[PDB]
Design a protein around this ligand. Structure first.
Ligand SMILES: [Zn+2]
Lengths: 93, 95, 72, 107, 34, 80, 107, 93, 84, 95
DNA sequence: AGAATCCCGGTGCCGAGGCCGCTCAATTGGTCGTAGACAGCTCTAGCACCGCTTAAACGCACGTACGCGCTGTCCCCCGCGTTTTAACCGCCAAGGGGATTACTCCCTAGTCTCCAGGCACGTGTCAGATATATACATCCTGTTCC
DNA sequence: GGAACAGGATGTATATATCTGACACGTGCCTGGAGACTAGGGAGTAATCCCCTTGGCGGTTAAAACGCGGGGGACAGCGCGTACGTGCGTTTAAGCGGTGCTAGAGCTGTCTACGACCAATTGAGCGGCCTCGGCACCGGGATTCT
């Protein structure tokens, strides 16, 4: 069967940042687990926030309050910045 | 005149047998508001909100003081000093 | 003309110098008022490790300049 | 009808479509809005970029070209904020930061 | 070159850790802290 | 201004006595002030962000106990 | 047909129907089995009865005939397994158990 | 509007375990929050378990497994026995 | 086919515990650290194994998996990376 | 002959800079199987399962040892004892 | 003097990354049911105010006891060498069950109708918070016999 | 001087009166829970491939075990002087009770864009192979630390 992961995507990110740097299998699995765990925490937090505000839908606002909850300080600031610019680009497109 | 420590133990007994709030609520509320302008200005706070805040604050501080007492007595002393404070916080993982 | 030196713990020291004094003069003054010998001092201003034999006017150090001190 | 991927539309290397599918089938909410997977993919891309950049810098400070779990642990435990995000984490073959209490060294 | 954030020394492009104060490079967006 | 100083030395003494401590040093009081300030900072930041997402201007006991639940310090008796 | 509540069918005092409603409408899973709410109501009833029984003994012990959060706190904290279950739980107006160190006592 | 709680059920349980034992409103609120918290923990663990086993249904089996995972020792044992008896009595109707 | 095996937790040996302390930054080790370490290590494994085998019996399997190990670890707040 | 302490410090540096496993694989596997003998019977294990188990045990023991070293220096000592062990576990919240 | 570790160069090997084949699931587009965005109205609890009383904090002194070196001791971990032992790697074989596919069946979401259980509301009444008085348990110092 | 004790002062549980506001009980109702029936997919059940796990054996040691010599660190007694408990008088403002305004939380009608479902598709992502370079391991200096 097909087993999904983030291998290609994380590899594209690595090639974007450091062109000549390679990645090992164990570190690659750590990367996949990290992305999965952050996805789980963030999306679960968004789900709970939508539940508390009696909202049945998850939107960019819920995701943004979730990242502002979970990521501290500077990480939250720049994560909101990059996400907002990505959303504006997607809506313009 | 009682020898030192006797009234301290009496205070320990009195406050352990009792559950009322040990923090003056108006100063605590003013402190909470002071912290509050740092995030959003002109906020309105529920009295139950500040009550739950001070309940949790008192519980966290009393647990921290219990752990500090354990630290100090492990250091074969009966007087706590702030080195026990940051030791307890580091051990708990809060810093 | 005063200059300001920053340490690694954020403690700022004030020195009274002139542009004509050399870097080793600043190091000796730091040793005098703080006990930090010139061999322990590494001085950064405008992205340069100030060489001991040169003077302040070579590095364009003006009044109330920001100096970084590193001890090793 | 020429198809352009949502990841390409948003300028993201992360799979916006796969994230949307996981959000739906992961039953976090009854319905999932359109902007949420894009925002989530951007956030994941940012965090991946930070971790990979720090790990690569750590590796190149060791004159090596492959990022390994030791490099990842060094990056995570050397970034204070990423450490706070990752406090309860155990990394396989992570090792520990080199640090000794000053009292243990002679003066 | 990149200039350091902690000690502000003119590190070369190949230096991924600072020469004297020994701090790692930060992003152009986020700079290192004390 | 400086209303953390309103958290009084007798109040810290009472809290320590409830904690079961006999002898209190001098630096304990403002050390406790500092740790209380940072703890309240974190809790209030989370609760105020909850109120922000709620499109509301009144911070409620519900939001504050939800922040407490997030921090691993869940509180009973105030709903939820 | 005559109405007969699912709690009566299971011999439970807890609201099996309400538990099922919170199960489906709380979007934990996209289908909920028929036996799932009954089991959950049973375990909730048993836990509530256990802690209330402990607090009842505490209330009777201190000659007070009304359960108070102080009794609730004594009940949970004097029980090892309930304390482990509620280690991170803070009780309002609960106070703390009377406990000082013996070495803390005067010599 | 109505704000539902476990007040009547908790009162019934307390009366059945203690014919002559009253309760205060604050303690009742504590009990309601406790019941909600335990429900949240158990049901969330069961939903997680069903998700991880690629299962889209919560039944008595994953509820039982979540109970055993959460409750310690003989508390878990007694809770499991009570749940099994309740399920048997309900399905035997 | 699998004979029971008693008296094996002495395999956590004194050099191994000493090496662990050396990694942890411990300067000097007393006599009873080995017995203390072995006991707490057994308790940690016992709690983890109880959770992991509960997962396994729920899955109607007989092979405890690395996945289930991470399952129980994340349940305990001890989440582990690189294993799935 | 080296004075006591220098060899220990070198060992500390080497093991902090290294990342390999510190517990022998077969004894740890036999310990895991012995513990598993009580809950279920005739259990089988994936090799990665006991590997991840060993990773967890290594990390938890290293963190506990670091914590107890901090407790020991706090008590003006450089040698740890089970009093330090129990103090660290108590304040962490397992005892 | 002697041991530990970095710098530099050769050899290998295996696995990381690039390339080919596939297939399935993400795109595109349209439809349609509805979640909520918004406007409007209501009332309530939250902020601000006042004054009074007295509970509690501030400040001062004073004794005192305990935190912090300082010392000496002693015994006990640590480093080192020898012996031994079982961990590890590579090889073998068996088969247990992990995982997969197909069939079917039955169980729960869903809709409709009905109906009664729990929630908002109201009110008597008693658990207890408070007050007063007291005898007994604690605690401490002054006095006395060895 | 040191251990034992009596008595005064203080704190506190114990014995009653009270008045009281929350608590438990009676009630309207309506909305959510229960009974009937459908259907269609989730999941149980049977058969199979073979992945991987268990068991074992032969060397080869790296590592564990044991014992010894000894210097270093835990521990105990000492002393002091400094910081903190204890008590008392004073000062501050916390808290109680009431009032008032209203900003904002909460409930309601609407209609609309926003997101689930379904059909066709095609390229992106995953499974498998091939190679070469980056790193493990090897050895000889050179530097550094004890
Ligand atoms: Zn620098």
């Amino acid at each position: 069967t097909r087993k999904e992961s983030y291998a290609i995507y994380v590899y594209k990110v690595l090639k974007q940042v450091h062109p000549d740097t390679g990645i090992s299998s164990k570190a690659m699995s750590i990367m996949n687990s990290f992305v999965n765990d952050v996805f789980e925490r963030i999306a679960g937090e968004a789900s709970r926030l939508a539940h508390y505000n009696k909202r049945s839908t998850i939107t960019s606002r819920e995701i943004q309050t979730a990242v502002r909850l979970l990521l501290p300080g500077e990480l939250a600031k720049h994560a909101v910045s990059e996400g907002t610019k990505a959303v504006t680009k997607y809506t313009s497109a | 005149r009682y020898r030192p420590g006797t009234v301290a133990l009496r205070e320990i007994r009195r406050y352990q047998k009792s559950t009322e709030l040990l923090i003056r609520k108006l100063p605590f509320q003013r402190l909470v508001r002071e912290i509050a302008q740092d995030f959003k200005t002109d906020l309105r706070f529920q009295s139950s909100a500040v009550m739950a805040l001070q309940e949790a604050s008192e519980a966290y501080l009393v647990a921290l003081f219990e752990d500090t007492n354990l630290c100090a007595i492990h250091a074969k002393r009966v007087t706590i000093m702030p080195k026990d404070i940051q030791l307890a916080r580091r051990i708990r993982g809060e810093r | 003309m005063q200059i300001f030196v920053k340490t690694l713990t954020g403690k700022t020291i004030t020195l009274e110098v002139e542009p004509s004094d050399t870097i080793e003069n600043v190091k000796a003054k730091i040793q005098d008022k703080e006990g930090i010998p010139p061999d322990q001092q590494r001085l950064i201003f405008a992205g340069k490790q100030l060489e001991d034999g040169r003077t302040l006017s070579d590095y364009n150090i003006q009044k109330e300049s920001t100096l970084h001190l590193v001890l090793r | 009808a020429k198809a352009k991927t949502r990841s390409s539309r948003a300028g993201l290397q992360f799979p916006v479509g796969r994230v949307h599918r996981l959000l739906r089938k992961g039953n976090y909410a009854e319905r999932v809005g359109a902007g949420a997977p894009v925002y989530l993919a951007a956030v994941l891309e940012y965090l991946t970029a930070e971790i990979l950049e720090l790990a690569g810098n750590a590796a190149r400070d060791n004159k090596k070209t492959r990022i390994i779990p030791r490099h990842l642990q060094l990056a995570v435990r050397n970034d204070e904020e990423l450490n706070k995000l990752l406090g309860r984490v155990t990394i396989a073959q992570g090792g520990v930061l080199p640090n000794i209490q000053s009292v243990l060294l002679p003066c | 070159f990149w200039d350091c954030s902690v000690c502000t020394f003119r590190n070369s492009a190949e230096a991924f850790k600072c020469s004297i104060c020994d701090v790692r490079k930060g992003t152009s967006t986020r700079k290192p802290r004390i | 201004r400086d209303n953390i100083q309103g958290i009084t030395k007798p109040a810290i003494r009472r809290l320590a006595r409830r904690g079961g401590v006999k002898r209190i040093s001098g630096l304990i009081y403002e050390e406790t002030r500092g740790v209380l300030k940072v703890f309240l900072e974190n809790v209030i930041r989370d609760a105020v962000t909850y109120t922000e997402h709620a499109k509301r201007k009144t911070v409620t006991a519900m939001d504050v106990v939800y922040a407490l639940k997030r921090q691993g310090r869940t509180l009973y008796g105030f709903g939820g």
